[PDB]
Amino acid sequence: QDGDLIYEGVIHREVPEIDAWAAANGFNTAGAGSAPIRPVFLCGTQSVFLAY
Amino acid sequence: AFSAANPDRLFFGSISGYSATWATGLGNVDAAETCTAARVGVMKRLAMSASPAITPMQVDDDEGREYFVAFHGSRTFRDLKGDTAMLNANREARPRDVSSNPLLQDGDLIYEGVIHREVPEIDAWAAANGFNTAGAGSAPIRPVFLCGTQSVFLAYAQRPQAGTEKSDIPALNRRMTVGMDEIIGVKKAAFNGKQHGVVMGFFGAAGD
Amino acid sequence: TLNIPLFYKLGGAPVTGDTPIVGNETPLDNYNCGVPVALRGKGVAITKNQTF
Amino acid sequence: RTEIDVMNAAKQSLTRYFGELLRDDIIEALGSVVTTGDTTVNYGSASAANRN
Amino acid sequence: MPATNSAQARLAAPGHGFGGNVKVSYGSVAFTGTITTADAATVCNLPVGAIVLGVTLESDDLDTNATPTITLNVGDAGSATRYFSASTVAQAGTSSSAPATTGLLWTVTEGNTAVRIAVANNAATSADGSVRVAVTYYLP
Amino acid sequence: MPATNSAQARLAAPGHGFGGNVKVSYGSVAFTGTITTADAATVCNLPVGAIVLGVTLESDDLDTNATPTITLNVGDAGSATRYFSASTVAQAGTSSSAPATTGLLWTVTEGNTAVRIAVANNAATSADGSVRVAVTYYLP
Amino acid sequence: MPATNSAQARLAAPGHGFGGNVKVSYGSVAFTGTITTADAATVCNLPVGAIVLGVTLESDDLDTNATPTITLNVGDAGSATRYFSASTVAQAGTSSSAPATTGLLWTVTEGNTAVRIAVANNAATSADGSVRVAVTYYLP
Amino acid sequence: MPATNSAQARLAAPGHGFGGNVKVSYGSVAFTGTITTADAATVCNLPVGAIVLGVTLESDDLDTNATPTITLNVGDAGSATRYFSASTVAQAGTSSSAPATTGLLWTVTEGNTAVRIAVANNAATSADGSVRVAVTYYLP
Amino acid sequence: MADFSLATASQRKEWSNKAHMEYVRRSRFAPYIRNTENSIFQGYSDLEKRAGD
């Protein structure tokens, strides 16, 4: 019953909308030999501020 | 016209085998492109990124879980539970119990959040419509229906009722007729020329 | 027959900086689906020549 | 011409659009480009010299 | 093939209310005396963030000669001949009411928010009349 | 003699408020790369119950040749050449800003609510530019 | 090869009872006086959901001439010549009792549920007689 | 012009049930020995108040000669040749299954309720066979 | 048939009042947006008070 999964102390959470972002910015090309690449964001604490 | 209106809900042999014409799209599924557990996960991915979204059967908002039901037709169901990999998933992750293991006592089986139910009468349907040919090189193919919520509507007007009659003479009981009657309508949910909650998938079932 | 409606999601751009909430309109999408209903049945006869 | 309430269907789909609008900004913030000292430019609107 | 959808590519779309249901600005400058090339006057004034749709220029007969030679320019402080260049609608032989053909769909900048009328060529015999300008535009 | 008063023959008559004080729709499609006859793009989108007043088409110089041959069509999904047919305002020798002359006062039907720009003739030497369309209309 | 089994491809199959064990409709229109091409009369009337099997047309001798020229048409309000076209069974030299050959297996529509007899050609010498029509059909 | 609607001119009109959904009567007379013109036999019997629709006559080969000459008549006690006159379907060279062409739509009278087969011409060489008659009609 | 035969354009229809929506999949960043100091995505309500830009 799939979900997030912990391994070696890091929690791996899935966000499906990063494919919609990264395909529009040209990551389906511009690899080694024009291969598709994707970004992975390993974040700690206080990485994005939110001002209401 | 059914293709090139559902490009995110029709899954042929691969996504690199989609075509706008129907007869060419069924000619891109090979006999070696069978139904493994790594290709049904592609169909679950198409159901989570559809442009009108398909409602899953059960949602868990935290630890995000979305559940679906796939209906196989027994020739893609034996390739799914009998592959060389993905078969030690239900003997190394199930509890050591005999009366509940679908490896020893077969049944439906869950893997990566989708429930795989077997319907044996899809072979009777799909053989009559010409799926024993019209693959890549005239190979047999079978459909797999990954459906979510509210995919087929059912409109009831009258429940089935029974009745009998004494036909020829009621005194000389020489004839009698029994019968049953029903008013019903069944239709797949369609809005704006698109399937509401079904993802169709075509795999090459050899049938050995 | 029986007709069933559907409402879609919402589509445009967030009215950035200066723009009203009275100037720049949206529609909300709306569709239909109708299921037709028909009679159907089946019967079986029993004689007396084949019954004694 | 209808009987379904378009008013309540347009108010529910409007609270639900400002929830998708929030995580569309966090994905855009994680893929930012920090040029020099609090100068974060989005990845689409960044030049080749801002990325180098 | 790389001709994509516009910088507009995602939104909904305007109707009834307080938006930029298109607008006008009208002036009636009155010329009198003798008419030389040292003439300049504002007729109307425009916003900053606005895009022009069309300029209509109607005038009277200002040079009543057998060979008329009066000639007008319509523009602003940046470009003196931005909307009309060598109009010749104030001549007593030709017709008035010429629509604008140059520089239509462009966003007004700062310091360009006043429409001037400058006289380009001297009048052979100056008469008394008036010149009307109507500038259509809208706002976001 | 049987020319009666119109299908309009009885009512009062509009002014200040939320009616159909006339409106616009503006788009700026950006052409780039090479320019062939396989180009199509929406610039703006129209209502259903509306009647068009006028379409203004201003573009840049897109074909910088000694003999330019680029040619645009403006229309919708029903008729590809409904508003403009063989415009030639994107050529680097002629002038831009041509007003519409065909198909003005007509009620928009369903499925015809998106204005396309299609390229009719190939460009001899493709440049980089943009094309602007402003469509005036109103509502009842 | 793609000639599949019919739109019928799944069911059982009819016998003794209240179904559409085939039916008739019979009329005997009586012509009298002089006989021109301004004659029309119903003989019988049909259901809505029914398919015709065959029409039998028997008449008397209506034109007793050395060269007979009387000529009948049998049809309904939609098509005046749907069943019979130029019958000539009412002539005193030829034989009667002609079966229908055109338009047999077709579902009756609404407004076509009355069989007319119209006279196509004038009678050279009108006699007194009668015309009989029997239309076989059935119901689902 | 005086061709009015029929003696039928006022009523509704039949369907599912116990009416005169059309009917048959079938007989198979067997000829044997030598065949002369002194032969007569009933095959079937009809009602009183009934109107005939059509008679079907199928027989075997009864005269196997190089020049066959057998000839049948089908009728009743009133008219010996009412339905068929000089049939010649029992000859071994021609085809069987001839439909009736004379005397179709007529009400049976009293004493005419038995269909006879009489032999009109002598058989040149008598064989053994059988003759089948099917008479379609209905009742009010 | 030849019973009471009703017309094709005279047959009733019915339209339902209950409408369906499209699924949204709320947020995968939702357990991580807090206002404390040990959160990944941190919020500030300082401009929700008096004034500021």
Side-chain angles (χ1 to χ4, degrees):
Chain A
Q1 297 175 356
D2 58 349
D4 57 356
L5 57 94
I6 185 164
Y7 182 74
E8 297 289 327
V10 55
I11 300 169
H12 298 282
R13 187 68 180 269
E14 180 186 2
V15 178
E17 291 87 4
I18 299 172
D19 284 334
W21 179 74
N25 295 115
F27 288 105
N28 287 320
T29 60
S34 297
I37 61 171
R38 298 295 175 188
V40 177
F41 298 106
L42 180 63
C43 64
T45 301
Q46 298 173 356
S47 63
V48 172
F49 297 122
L50 298 175
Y52 296 106
Chain B
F2 179 67
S3 297
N6 298 112
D8 55 353
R9 290 170 181 173
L10 295 175
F11 178 72
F12 296 101
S14 65
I15 294 175
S16 66
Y18 179 76
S19 178
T21 60
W22 184 262
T24 305
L26 293 179
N28 291 320
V29 47
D30 295 330
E33 290 177 350
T34 62
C35 181
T36 62
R39 286 166 181 163
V40 187
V42 178
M43 291 174 68
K44 185 178 183 291
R45 182 178 62 82
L46 292 175
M48 294 189 288
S49 66
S51 297
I54 296 169
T55 302
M57 181 180 70
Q58 182 180 1
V59 184
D60 194 1
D61 290 331
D62 194 1
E63 61 183 0
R65 296 185 175 177
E66 291 180 352
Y67 291 157
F68 294 99
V69 176
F71 291 104
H72 294 283
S74 72
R75 281 174 59 174
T76 60
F77 186 75
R78 65 103 187 272
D79 291 330
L80 190 274
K81 70 180 177 66
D83 51 353
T84 61
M86 307 296 178
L87 179 61
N88 49 7
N90 58 5
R91 66 179 181 267
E92 294 181 354
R94 301 296 293 260
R96 289 177 179 269
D97 195 1
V98 191
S99 64
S100 66
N101 195 359
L103 185 65
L104 299 174
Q105 297 175 356
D106 58 349
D108 57 356
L109 57 94
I110 185 164
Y111 182 74
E112 297 289 327
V114 55
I115 300 169
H116 298 282
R117 187 68 180 269
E118 180 186 2
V119 178
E121 291 87 3
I122 299 172
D123 283 335
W125 179 74
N129 295 115
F131 288 105
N132 287 320
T133 60
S138 297
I141 61 171
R142 298 296 175 188
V144 177
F145 298 106
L146 180 63
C147 64
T149 301
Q150 298 173 356
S151 63
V152 172
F153 297 122
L154 298 175
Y156 296 106
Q158 183 185 1
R159 299 290 183 182
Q161 296 178 358
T164 185
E165 187 185 5
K166 293 181 181 179
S167 295
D168 196 0
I169 292 172
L172 298 174
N173 297 115
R174 296 181 68 189
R175 192 172 178 85
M176 184 180 65
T177 302
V178 296
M180 186 168 285
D181 201 6
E182 188 185 5
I183 312 173
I184 200 170
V186 181
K187 183 180 179 179
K188 182 169 73 175
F191 291 95
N192 199 2
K194 295 179 76 68
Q195 288 174 347
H196 189 198
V198 183
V199 177
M200 291 177 70
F202 293 97
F203 297 102
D208 56 352
Chain C
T1 188
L2 198 149
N3 298 111
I4 300 100
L6 177 72
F7 290 108
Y8 276 178
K9 201 177 70 177
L10 199 147
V15 294
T16 302
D18 53 346
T19 21
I21 314 169
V22 80
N24 3 351
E25 282 85 351
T26 18
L28 183 63
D29 289 332
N30 193 1
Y31 295 101
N32 196 4
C33 181
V35 289
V37 177
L39 180 68
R40 67 185 187 176
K42 175 63 74 177
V44 171
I46 293 97
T47 63
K48 192 179 74 175
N49 196 4
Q50 300 293 322
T51 306
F52 69 99
Chain D
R1 296 177 179 177
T2 62
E3 192 179 1
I4 53 177
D5 47 352
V6 187
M7 177 179 176
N8 199 4
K11 291 172 71 175
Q12 291 179 356
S13 68
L14 195 62
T15 69
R16 202 169 67 238
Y17 175 68
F18 282 91
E20 291 181 352
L21 193 64
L22 181 60
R23 94 285 191 275
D24 201 4
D25 290 332
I26 298 172
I27 296 169
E28 192 69 30
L30 290 173
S32 296
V33 169
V34 178
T35 302
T36 47
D38 309 334
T39 304
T40 60
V41 181
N42 290 320
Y43 185 78
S45 65
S47 66
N50 291 319
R51 294 174 183 174
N52 295 321
Chain E
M1 285 76 75
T4 63
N5 293 115
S6 55
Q8 296 92 5
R10 199 183 173 182
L11 252 179
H16 284 178
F18 282 171
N21 37 6
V22 290
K23 296 175 184 298
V24 277
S25 66
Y26 173 89
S28 178
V29 62
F31 291 173
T32 184
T34 184
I35 299 169
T36 62
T37 61
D39 294 333
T42 66
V43 287
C44 61
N45 46 4
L46 268 69
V48 178
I51 282 191
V52 184
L53 261 291
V55 181
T56 302
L57 179 62
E58 180 179 0
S59 67
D60 292 333
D61 47 352
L62 273 69
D63 191 75
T64 61
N65 197 2
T67 303
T69 182
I70 194 167
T71 293
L72 295 172
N73 290 325
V74 176
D76 53 358
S79 178
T81 61
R82 182 170 287 169
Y83 299 106
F84 289 97
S85 300
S87 177
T88 68
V89 298
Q91 295 178 357
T94 62
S95 177
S96 65
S97 296
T101 60
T102 60
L104 277 304
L105 295 170
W106 64 279
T107 304
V108 180
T109 60
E110 183 67 30
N112 297 117
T113 65
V115 176
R116 298 293 183 94
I117 292 176
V119 177
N121 194 1
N122 291 316
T125 170
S126 297
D128 194 0
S130 67
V131 177
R132 279 88 65 192
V133 177
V135 175
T136 59
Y137 65 92
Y138 69 104
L139 298 184
Chain F
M1 285 76 75
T4 63
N5 293 115
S6 55
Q8 296 92 5
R10 199 183 173 182
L11 252 179
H16 284 178
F18 282 171
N21 37 6
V22 290
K23 296 175 184 298
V24 277
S25 66
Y26 173 89
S28 178
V29 62
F31 290 173
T32 184
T34 184
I35 299 169
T36 62
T37 61
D39 294 333
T42 66
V43 287
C44 61
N45 46 4
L46 268 69
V48 178
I51 282 191
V52 184
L53 261 291
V55 181
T56 302
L57 179 62
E58 180 179 0
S59 67
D60 292 333
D61 47 352
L62 273 69
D63 191 75
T64 61
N65 197 2
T67 303
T69 182
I70 194 167
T71 293
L72 295 172
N73 290 325
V74 176
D76 53 358
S79 178
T81 61
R82 182 170 287 170
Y83 299 106
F84 289 97
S85 300
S87 177
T88 68
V89 298
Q91 295 178 356
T94 62
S95 177
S96 65
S97 296
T101 60
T102 60
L104 277 305
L105 294 170
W106 63 279
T107 304
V108 180
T109 60
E110 183 67 30
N112 297 117
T113 64
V115 176
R116 298 293 183 94
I117 292 176
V119 177
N121 194 1
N122 291 316
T125 170
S126 296
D128 194 0
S130 67
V131 177
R132 279 88 65 192
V133 177
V135 175
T136 59
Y137 65 92
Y138 69 104
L139 298 184
Chain G
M1 285 76 75
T4 63
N5 293 115
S6 55
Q8 296 92 5
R10 199 183 173 182
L11 252 179
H16 284 178
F18 282 171
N21 37 6
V22 290
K23 297 175 184 298
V24 277
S25 66
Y26 173 89
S28 178
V29 62
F31 291 173
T32 184
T34 184
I35 299 169
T36 62
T37 61
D39 294 333
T42 66
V43 287
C44 61
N45 46 4
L46 268 69
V48 178
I51 282 191
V52 184
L53 261 291
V55 181
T56 302
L57 179 62
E58 180 179 0
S59 67
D60 292 333
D61 47 352
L62 273 69
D63 192 75
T64 61
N65 197 2
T67 304
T69 182
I70 194 167
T71 293
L72 295 172
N73 290 325
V74 176
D76 53 358
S79 178
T81 61
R82 182 170 287 169
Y83 299 106
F84 289 97
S85 300
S87 177
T88 68
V89 298
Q91 295 178 357
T94 62
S95 177
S96 65
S97 296
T101 60
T102 60
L104 277 304
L105 295 170
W106 63 279
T107 304
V108 180
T109 60
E110 183 66 30
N112 297 117
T113 65
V115 176
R116 298 293 183 94
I117 292 176
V119 177
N121 194 1
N122 291 316
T125 170
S126 296
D128 194 0
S130 67
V131 177
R132 279 88 65 192
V133 177
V135 175
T136 59
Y137 65 92
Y138 69 104
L139 298 183
Chain H
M1 285 76 75
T4 63
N5 293 115
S6 55
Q8 296 92 5
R10 199 183 173 182
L11 252 179
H16 284 178
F18 282 171
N21 37 6
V22 290
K23 296 175 184 298
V24 277
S25 66
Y26 173 89
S28 178
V29 62
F31 291 173
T32 184
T34 184
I35 299 169
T36 62
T37 61
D39 294 333
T42 66
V43 287
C44 61
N45 46 4
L46 268 69
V48 178
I51 282 191
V52 184
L53 261 291
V55 181
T56 302
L57 179 62
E58 180 179 0
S59 67
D60 292 333
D61 47 352
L62 273 69
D63 191 75
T64 61
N65 197 2
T67 304
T69 182
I70 194 167
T71 293
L72 295 172
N73 290 325
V74 176
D76 53 358
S79 178
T81 61
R82 182 170 287 170
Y83 299 106
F84 289 97
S85 300
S87 177
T88 68
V89 298
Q91 295 178 357
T94 62
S95 177
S96 65
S97 296
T101 60
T102 60
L104 277 304
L105 295 170
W106 64 279
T107 304
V108 180
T109 60
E110 183 66 30
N112 297 117
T113 65
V115 176
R116 298 293 183 94
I117 292 176
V119 177
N121 194 1
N122 291 316
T125 170
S126 296
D128 194 0
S130 67
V131 177
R132 279 88 65 192
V133 177
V135 175
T136 59
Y137 65 92
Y138 69 104
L139 298 184
Chain I
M1 293 179 71
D3 291 333
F4 179 74
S5 178
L6 195 144
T8 62
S10 178
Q11 293 177 357
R12 188 175 169 83
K13 296 188 186 295
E14 183 69 28
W15 289 264
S16 180
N17 201 4
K18 266 64 186 298
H20 300 293
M21 296 294 173
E22 172 173 351
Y23 181 70
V24 164
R25 189 174 60 244
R26 178 258 183 90
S27 182
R28 291 287 189 267
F29 298 110
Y32 293 144
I33 299 169
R34 296 280 86 84
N35 284 317
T36 61
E37 292 86 4
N38 55 3
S39 65
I40 300 172
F41 307 108
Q42 187 177 3
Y44 288 98
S45 66
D46 292 332
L47 298 178
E48 187 176 359
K49 293 185 285 185
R50 296 181 66 181
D53 194 6

